[PDB]
Amino acid sequence: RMVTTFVALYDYESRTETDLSFKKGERLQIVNNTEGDWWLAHSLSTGQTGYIPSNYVAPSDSIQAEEWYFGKITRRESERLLLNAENPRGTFLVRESETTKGAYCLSVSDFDNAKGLNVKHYKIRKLDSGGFYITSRTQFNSLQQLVAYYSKHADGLCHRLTTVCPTSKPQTQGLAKDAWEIPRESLRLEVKLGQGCFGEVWMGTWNGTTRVAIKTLKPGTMSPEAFLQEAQVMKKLRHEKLVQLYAVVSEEPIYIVTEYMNKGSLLDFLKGETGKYLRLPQLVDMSAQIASGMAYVERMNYVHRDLRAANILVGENLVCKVADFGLARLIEDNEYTARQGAKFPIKWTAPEAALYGRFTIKSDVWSFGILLTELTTKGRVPYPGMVNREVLDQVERGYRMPCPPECPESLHDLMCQCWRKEPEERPTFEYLQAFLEDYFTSTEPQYQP
Numbered sequence: 001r002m003v004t005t006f007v008a009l010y011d012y013e014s015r016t017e018t019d020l021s022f023k024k025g026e027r028l029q030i031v032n033n034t035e036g037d038w039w040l041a042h043s044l045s046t047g048q049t050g051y052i053p054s055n056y057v058a059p060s061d062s063i064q065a066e067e068w069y070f071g072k073i074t075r076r077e078s079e080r081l082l083l084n085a086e087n088p089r090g091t092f093l094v095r096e097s098e099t100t101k102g103a104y105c106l107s108v109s110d111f112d113n114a115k116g117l118n119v120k121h122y123k124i125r126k127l128d129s130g131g132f133y134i135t136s137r138t139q140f141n142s143l144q145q146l147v148a149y150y151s152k153h154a155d156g157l158c159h160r161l162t163t164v165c166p167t168s169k170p171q172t173q174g175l176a177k178d179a180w181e182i183p184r185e186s187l188r189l190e191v192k193l194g195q196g197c198f199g200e201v202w203m204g205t206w207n208g209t210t211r212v213a214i215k216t217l218k219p220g221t222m223s224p225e226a227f228l229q230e231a232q233v234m235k236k237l238r239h240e241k242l243v244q245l246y247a248v249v250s251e252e253p254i255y256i257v258t259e260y261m262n263k264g265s266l267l268d269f270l271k272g273e274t275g276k277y278l279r280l281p282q283l284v285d286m287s288a289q290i291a292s293g294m295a296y297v298e299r300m301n302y303v304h305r306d307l308r309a310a311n312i313l314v315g316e317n318l319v320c321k322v323a324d325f326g327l328a329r330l331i332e333d334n335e336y337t338a339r340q341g342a343k344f345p346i347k348w349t350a351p352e353a354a355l356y357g358r359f360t361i362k363s364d365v366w367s368f369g370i371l372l373t374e375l376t377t378k379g380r381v382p383y384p385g386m387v388n389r390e391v392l393d394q395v396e397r398g399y400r401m402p403c404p405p406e407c408p409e410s411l412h413d414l415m416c417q418c419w420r421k422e423p424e425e426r427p428t429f430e431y432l433q434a435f436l437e438d439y440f441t442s443t444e445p446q447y448q449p
């Protein structure tokens with residue numbers, strides 16, 4: 001539209017030559033309201049120029065520039081951030097209301113003798129004049145004044161506003177502008193994060209600036225021609241609960257570069273000291289994150305084909321994202337193609353997918369039901385007293401895992417819905433997400449009056 005002045009929200013190290021290195025606070029000259037994930041910018045601070053990630057800047061002198069404004073973040077995700085144990089009382093953020101378009105919301109962390117650590121949500125009424133107010137008896141001209149005022153007096157709020165909600169730098173959309181197929185010499189593998197059946201995983205760095213996860217397929221796993229073909233679709237899948245596909249190295253051995261999840265896989269995270277303190281409310285919430293990512297996959301008319309706790313990756317504040325979606329199809333192994341052998345996840349595979357190769361989003365729904373048993377058992381293998389060989393015949397005859405101990409029979413009933421024989425009667429991920437987000441009377445409710 002018209003080159004305007006922007007401000008940097010976070011630091012960013014120049015990963016390439018064409019991008020722009022800038023620190024939080026730098027005034028940037030960018031073409032206003034220009035579509036894309038990478039915008040051309042001119043730094044009025046350093047006089048340097050280059051492309052910048054569009055989610056690292058906001059118009060100067062706008063609410064988006066304020067560090068306590070989190071934009072279109074959900075009530076459920078705001079609570080995740082605010083309920084962090086290291087946040088003091090009065091840790092807050094401002095966001096948009098999900099139940100009242102045009103209104104804002106002040107989310108604040110608080111402590112109570114009944115609930116303990118909880119978040120209070122206060123709706124902010126914006127006026128035609130531009131003024132904001134939480135209660136009728138105290139009003140302000142700007143959202144900034146409101147924050148300043150309640151940072152000195154609770155005056156009705158559960159607690160004075162103390163700290164702004166901590167946040168980690170968001171992901172850029174792609175490693176760089178036009179960056180997709182990269183050379184192997186651009187990746188530097190630093191730490192082996194783990195090992196799979198068809199290759200290894202690595203913590204590395206691209207251009208020695210940005211930390212990424214590098215998956216290395218052993219030769220013969222999949223043809224580069226078909227991997228690149230499918231990778232043009234996986235690069236389109238962008239959602240907060242999907243691990244982002246960054247780049248690829250075409251020449252075998254194929255390397256897959258993805259966003260790095262520091263807490264490891266959900267399965268391992270459910271075991272050991274990490275999973276000791278997890279309680280059902282957190283497991284249900286983690287299920288809702290997974291269902292949200294799969295609901296996006298469901299909207300894009302895509303199929304995961306290998307949904308299981310081992311392919312869910314954990315981050316800070318118990319963030320969970322779906323990983324390794326769409327790779328299972330490209331496996332060239334004759335035994336995995338015919339879903340046989342000790343390397344096929346038969347215990348997460350719907351019977352019609354294992355018997356007739358009918359992989360659909362509904363067979364992922366089946367997999368989700370299995371995944372829920374891993375969550376409510378903290379990593380226990382499905383069908384524990386059964387070997388792969390015998391699972392498919394038992395579920396084909398109608399056997400279903402019973403309600404695990406420490407699993408509410410209401411969630412096992414959800415599991416059995418996912419385990420219906422008829423795929424088209426299995427529920428959607430839109431349903432599962434809403435069900436699991438509202439499991440504890442948690443359906444968008446109760447802004448404090």
Ligand SMILES: Nc1ncnc2c1ncn2[C@@H]1O[C@H](COP(=O)(O)OP(=O)(O)O)[C@@H](O)[C@H]1O
Binds near residue numbers: 243258260
């Ligand atoms: N994007 C990632 N970020 C951080 N760690 C990862 C990532 N992807 C995989 N890992 C780690 O590497 C290991 C191997 O992953 P993978 O080869 O997909 O094994 P599988 O899918 O069979 O569990 C996992 O246990 C996980 O902890």
Ligand SMILES: [Mg+2]
Binds near residue numbers: 310311324
């Ligand atoms: Mg995997």
